[PDB]
Design a binder for these strands. Structure first.
Ligand SMILES: Nc1ncnc2c1ncn2[C@@H]1O[C@H](COP(=O)(O)OP(=O)(O)OP(=O)(O)O)[C@@H](O)[C@H]1O
Ligand SMILES: [Mg+2]
Ligand SMILES: [Mg+2]
Length: 341
DNA sequence: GGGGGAAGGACTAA
DNA sequence: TCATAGTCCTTCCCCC
């Protein structure tokens, strides 16, 4: 299997550039303004001009302004980025029916039946970068290898505006050298549990007692890491099916007053159903972001489709169940639907 | 012993 | 006042 992975570069920021060419060269910061106070919120992303100085996805807009008070700050326009994204995905289908859209800016193409070696793949990668730059003036990084995971690692190494192949020999090389924390699926919490076992390279997972690793990081991740170690991982590229759709919204001020949170809850439902678009969910969950940031969630599954009417009354029950089972004030409130028919 | 689903918190990522 | 969507893992639970 020859997988080709595509990841758009500093996407939201780059799209803002394409719609306003005069931003080219200046640090650009796309923000999610929460609204409780001027400059409240986080950075969704930044171009490399801004990123070069420490301004990057996740930090408070406040900080970014202290680092680069003169960078361009723009409100995130997801709808716009999503349409640009869809158009790019379509260009990708012209290269393989077997395509997996991982996120708004990531996709895997199984090009096994399109090329015969990593040389042709590489050229096809170039064709793709030029096609996109051409049609949408968007630069992307291409990663090529024998499976989804390494194709993604290839990309991580070559970004931005790059392209890299990781042949079988380099795979085995990485299995021993590559820092295990840089493996897709391994987060901080998991990276830590691993270090606490001397495990710092994939190979180290082959020498350790399984049940020992399993009891530490869970059975699924254990099998995942090992299979990668044995150079055996090869999950198929498959059309993705969003299993759930929801929306969570931050409130002006925290509280635990049902009637004061209702507005937000309902606003979150209207926005969600909209997104549902044709989909009828059989399950629903009300999600809460406590003052301390912990997450409290209570949901329920029904034996049939959920009407917006139901969603309404039902969400209030779940909301209160949360209210009674947690004495914390709520910072953000949202809803989430799943188990579509 | 395990198929299978429902619920709640974990974990990645974003 | 710093703090922005989704997928699974783990557990209990009915039950063949
Ligand atoms: N912390 C974040 N919060 C919300 N959205 C984020 C965050 N980080 C990234 N994104 C969104 O996801 C998109 C895709 O993510 P990705 O990490 O690939 O993008 P990027 O910011 O361009 O960086 P890279 O060039 O390394 O891919 C971004 O354009 C945005
Ligand atoms: Mg990405
Ligand atoms: Mg990207």
């Amino acid at each position: 299997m020859i997988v080709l992975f595509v990841d758009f570069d500093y996407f939201y920021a780059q799209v803002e550039e394409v719609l306003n060419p005069s931003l080219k060269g200046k640090p650009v910061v796309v923000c999610v303004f929460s609204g409780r106070f001027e400059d409240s919120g986080a950075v969704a992303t930044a171009n490399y001009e801004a990123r070069k100085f420490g301004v990057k996805a996740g930090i408070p807009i406040v900080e970014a302004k202290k680092i680069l008070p003169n960078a361009v700050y723009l409100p995130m326009r997801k709808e716009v980025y999503q349409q640009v994204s869809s158009r790019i995905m379509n260009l990708l289908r012209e290269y393989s029916e077997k395509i997996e859209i991982a996120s708004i800016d990531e996709a895997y193409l199984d090009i096994s039946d399109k090329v015969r070696d990593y040389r042709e793949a590489y050229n096809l990668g170039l064709e793709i970068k030029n096609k996109i730059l051409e049609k949408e003036k968007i630069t992307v990084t291409v990663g090529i290898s024998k499976n989804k995971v390494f194709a993604k690692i290839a990309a991580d190494m070559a970004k931005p505006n790059g392209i890299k192949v990781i042949d079988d020999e380099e795979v085995k090389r990485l299995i021993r050298e590559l820092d295990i924390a840089d493996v897709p699926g391994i987060g901080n919490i998991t990276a830590e549990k691993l270090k606490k076992l001397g495990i710092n390279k994939l190979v180290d997972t082959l020498s350790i007692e399984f049940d020992k690793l399993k009891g530490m990081i869970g059975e699924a991740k254990a099998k995942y890491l090992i299979s990668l170690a044995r150079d055996e991982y090869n999950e198929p590229i498959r059309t993705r099916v969003r299993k759930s759709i929801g929306r969570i919204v931050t409130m002006k001020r925290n509280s635990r007053n049902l009637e004061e949170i209702k507005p937000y809850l309902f606003r979150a439902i209207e926005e969600s159903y909209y997104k549902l678009d044709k989909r009828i969910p059989k399950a629903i969950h009300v999600v809460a972001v406590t003052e301390d940031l912990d997450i409290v969630s209570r949901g329920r599954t029904f034996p049939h489709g959920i009407s917006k009417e139901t969603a309404y009354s039902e969400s209030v029950k779940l909301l209160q169940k949360i209210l009674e089972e947690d004495e914390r004030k709520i910072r953000r409130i949202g809803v989430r639907f799943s188990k579509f028919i």
